[PDB]
Design a protein around this ligand. Sequence first.
Ligand SMILES: CCCO[C@@H]1O[C@@H]([C@H](O)CO)[C@H](O[C@H]2O[C@H](CO)[C@H](O)[C@H](O[C@@H]3O[C@@H]([C@H](O)CO)[C@H](O[C@H]4O[C@H](CO)[C@H](O)[C@H](O)[C@H]4O)[C@H]3O)[C@H]2O)[C@H]1O
Ligand SMILES: [Cl-]
Ligand SMILES: [Cl-]
Ligand SMILES: [Cl-]
Ligand code: NA
Length: 130
Amino acid sequence: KVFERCELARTLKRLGMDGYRGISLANWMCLAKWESGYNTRATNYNAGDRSTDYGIFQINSRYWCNDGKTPGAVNACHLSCSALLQDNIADAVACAKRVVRDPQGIRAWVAWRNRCQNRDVRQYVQGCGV
Ligand SMILES: CCCO[C@@H]1O[C@@H]([C@H](O)CO)[C@H](O[C@H]2O[C@H](CO)[C@H](O)[C@H](O[C@@H]3O[C@@H]([C@H](O)CO)[C@H](O[C@H]4O[C@H](CO)[C@H](O)[C@H](O)[C@H]4O)[C@H]3O)[C@H]2O)[C@H]1O
Ligand SMILES: [Cl-]
Ligand SMILES: [Cl-]
Ligand SMILES: [Cl-]
Ligand code: NA
């Protein structure tokens, strides 16, 4: 599914993302916007390294979920990558929380560094009731 902005913001808030390991809801929204356009079914094969990015946060198969076809990969979220393509984003949120338990936090996603870090991210949550 493709979420509408404020629908996603409320969804993420209910799932406990606001302030998770210091990351405001607006930062998660900016991340989802730029990675997938709020689209849970999105995929992107990385021909450079044979991994694939999955779902609304474009979580990558080398460390985070198992797709079987990524060489030398691990599955830290304990999920099939299929779980990251559901309309219900609970498993994607649990996995995003796992990603940010590692040292680099929200910086794990270069898109967040490019498009969200040190920016005014307030617009992503304006008017959503969060
Ligand atoms: C085996 C010895 C080290 O193992 C440790 O355990 C890893 C995890 O905690 C899971 O068990 C640790 O991972 C951390 O260090 C490794 C070193 O290779 C990586 O730097 C991890 O970061 C991830 O690696 C990136 C690429 O897969 C490889 O460069 C990931 O970025 C990609 O996925 C992101 C989230 O989906 C995002 O999509 C980025 O845009 C992608 O490029 C990054 O998450 C690091 O946490 C390891 O120490
Ligand atoms: Cl911030
Ligand atoms: Cl679903
Ligand atoms: Cl920062
Ligand atoms: Na409003």
